[PDB]
Design a protein around this ligand. Structure first.
Ligand SMILES: [Mn+2]
Ligand SMILES: [Mn+2]
Length: 316
């Protein structure tokens, strides 16, 4: 709970992303979003920190754009200052082309340098910048030293970035853990998975994506949770213990592995238990495919793999 000062660190929503070309997948993304926004409007943090990739394209579907203005307009009418850094998907490619973030200019401040927020009441230091490509790594080194210099005489200092770091995204990454200065809090984004762990005299954060945009984020979803992280900075120091990570419910995926009767019955009991039609993935032996075709109507989509091979490898 709390507090005296508080704020949210969310990232990666990918509004307008129509997975498996499913009209219905498009929708779920806006829902997890519209959801997150609802939590945050309750919690009323004094400021919000969006580590980028709010959108999923330089020219989003109109609805994604509207939902995102309506959202942040609400946030801003409710006296909550928002900072957002530009992710890869929000960076213009041709000279003069404009991000789709440049539609949230009135509700949101885009970080590309340094600023200090008086809050109520106190003083803290934000710096962050947009998404630079692996190549522009050098460009950035300077960017951070500069940042560091103006950040030293400042007790509480926050860093916003949308990039692949090296201890965290083995390939491909654009920065090294040893590339970046020492800050109270590292509000990053671009890693679609919740990653809160202390770091160089402060705490690093990877809000994570707000809905299973892969193709991986399965177990990560269920064990940890997708959504944002709620920080507060009411108190001097900060440990993993003053960061209340909020979870956000979404479309249920079920992993199947269908190879005997045991596991074909398993995969169904899991799909009964499902509150909503699920996206189902994993493997299904070819021989059971058409038996499982039997649940077409209880299932949003079947993105499991059909296995034509026969396996002997038992368990020990
Ligand atoms: Mn992303
Ligand atoms: Mn990204």
């Amino acid at each position: 709970r709390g507090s005296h000062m508080m704020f949210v660190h969310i990232a990666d929503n990918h509004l307008g992303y129509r997975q498996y070309n499913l009209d219905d997948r498009e929708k779920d993304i806006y829902d997890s979003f519209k959801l997150c926004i609802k939590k945050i409007l309750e919690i009323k943090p004094d400021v919000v920190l969006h580590s980028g990739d709010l959108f999923n394209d330089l020219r989003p579907p109109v609805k994604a754009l509207r939902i995102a203005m309506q959202a942040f307009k609400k946030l801003h009418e409710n006296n909550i200052k928002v900072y957002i850094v530009a992710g890869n998907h929000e960076m213009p490619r041709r000279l003069g082309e404009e991000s789709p973030l440049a539609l949230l200019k009135d509700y949101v401040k885009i970080l590309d340098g340094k600023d200090v927020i008086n809050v109520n009441g106190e003083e803290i230091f934000i710096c962050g910048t947009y998404y630079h490509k692996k190549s522009k790594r050098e460009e950035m080194l300077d960017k951070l030293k500069n940042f560091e210099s103006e950040a030293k005489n400042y007790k509480k200092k926050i860093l916003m970035l949308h990039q692949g770091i090296n201890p965290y995204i083995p390939l491909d990454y654009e920065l090294e853990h040893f590339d970046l200065p020492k800050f109270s809090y590292y509000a990053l984004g671009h890693i679609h998975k919740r990653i809160l762990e202390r770091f160089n005299d402060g705490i690093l954060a990877y809000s994570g994506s707000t809905e299973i945009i892969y193709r991986n984020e399965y177990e990560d979803y269920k064990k940890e949770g997708k959504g944002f992280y709620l920080v507060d900075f009411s108190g001097n120091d900060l440990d993993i213990s003053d960061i209340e990570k909020i979870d956000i419910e979404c479309r249920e995926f079920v992993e199947v592995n269908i190879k005997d009767k045991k596991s074909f019955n398993e995969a169904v009991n899991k799909i009964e238990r499902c509150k909503n039609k699920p996206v189902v993935f994993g493997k299904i032996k070819r021989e059971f495919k058409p038996w499982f075709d039997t649940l077409k109507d209880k299932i949003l989509i079947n993105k499991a793999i059909i296995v034509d091979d026969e396996f002997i490898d038992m368990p020990d």
